């Protein structure tokens, strides 16, 4: 099964937080610009068709077991000119309120704790050419999942990260049977100093620095029918920990872990690449991929199929995804569902993700 997974701090940053991208196999770096294009590619916020947008996304966890354990997302975007846009997103994972109770006269006042984990980011995107755009984002991450007891300190752990994204969208190009469109995107994510959960520099965790590279094509038929096919590749920019042994039995493992944990995040970004005696094929096992197809009718109905494949050596997240989207007047509703194909139980199995966006303001034409 999973041999040597990459250990990163705040892994909740890697979870898809909107139903549209979830229904497309957890990919958004090269899909069409939308209100959720902050976790995936902020650079396409400059390609938005509506001036302003707001969005609320709900991803429940352990639906059969309990309520209120969920990852929510609130996104807002405002493109001021036809070339630039500002965006701000907030992701919040929570277990809900938990009451701390001893029997102790059960009418007694009780303390409610809400262990949570949130990220708040703001991005600026600017169109360089008519077909290309770039974006820079700044994110603050806070983790408060611990509950204060005796001999347990529940101080929150915080960190900062930066995001560099690029998005290319071509104009409509006529072909023999259809007039499609081309899209490409890259996104370097979560570049920042290590997060210390125990507030000690010796015990710090890498931020989940990530690289997404994707490309997509739009088959446009009849001016009312669209088929967007997108492919995304993802690589974690965190060094892989040592495994069984990389030449005193436990001494070698201890020394290897000591040298691995004493690696800077900046240097770790480059150490993620290579670090193997083999070639590109041996390094291909650290690349996750996803393929998505989205059929769109009258820009008002959307039907999404997706496939996400991690290498079973790390993570073991392999699944198919179903998605649907509707647009009434200015309100868009997305629903997504997951069919797992992995041996390890997916925490988002048998779960319906919900998304709801409001679009308002001026309308921009698409080049």
């Amino acid at each position: 099964d999973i041999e040597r997974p990459i250990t990163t701090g705040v892994p909740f940053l890697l979870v898809a937080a909107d139903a549209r991208a979830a229904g497309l196999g957890d990919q958004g770096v090269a899909t069409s610009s939308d209100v959720f294009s902050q976790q995936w590619n902020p650079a396409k916020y400059a390609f938005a068709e509506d001036a302003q947008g707001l969005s609320i996304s709900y991803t429940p966890y352990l639906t059969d077991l309990a309520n209120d354990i969920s990852l929510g997302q609130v996104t807002y975007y405002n493109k001021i000119n036809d070339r630039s846009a500002f965006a701000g997103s907030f992701r919040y994972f929570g277990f809900g309120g938990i009451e701390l109770r001893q029997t102790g006269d059960p009418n007694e006042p009780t303390r409610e704790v809400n262990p949570n984990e949130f990220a708040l980011d703001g991005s600026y995107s600017l169109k360089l050419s008519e077909t290309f755009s770039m974006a820079v984002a700044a994110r603050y991450i806070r983790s408060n999942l611990k509950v204060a007891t005796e001999e347990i300190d529940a101080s929150a752990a915080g960190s900062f990260a930066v995001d560099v994204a690029g998005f290319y969208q071509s104009e409509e190009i006529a072909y023999s049977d259809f007039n499609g469109r081309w899209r490409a995107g890259f996104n370097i994510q979560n570049l920042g100093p290590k997060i210390s959960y125990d507030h000690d520099d010796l015990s710090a965790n890498f931020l989940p620095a990530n690289l997404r590279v994707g490309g997509g094509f739009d088959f446009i038929f009849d001016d009312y029918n669209k088929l967007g096919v997108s492919l995304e590749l993802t690589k974690l920019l965190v060094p892989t920990p040592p495994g069984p042994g990389t030449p005193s039995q436990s001494q070698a493992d201890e020394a290897n872990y000591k040298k691995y944990k004493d690696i800077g995040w900046v240097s770790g970004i480059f150490k993620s690449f290579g670090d193997a005696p083999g070639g590109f094929s041996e390094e291909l096992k650290e690349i996750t991929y996803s393929a998505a197809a989205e059929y769109m009718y009258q820009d008002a109905f959307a039907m999404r199929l997706g496939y996400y494949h991690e290498s079973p050596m790390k993570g073991a997240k392999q699944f198919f995804s179903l998605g649907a989207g509707f647009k009434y007047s200015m309100i868009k509703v997305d629903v997504s569902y997951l069919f797992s194909a992995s041996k390890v139980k997916n925490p988002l199995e048998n779960t319906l993700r919900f998304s709801l966006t409001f679009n308002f303001g001026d309308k921009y034409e698409t080049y």
């Binding site: 104009e171 409509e172 034409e365």
Partner: peptide
């Protein structure tokens, strides 16, 4: 009382020209 590809390309060219002229 007063060759679909070529048509699609002509429509795209007309749309581009109209969108360029309208804003300026």
């Amino acid at each position: 009382n007063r060759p679909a590809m070529a048509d699609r390309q002509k429509a795209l060219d007309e749309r581009r020209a109209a969108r360029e002229k309208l804003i300026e």
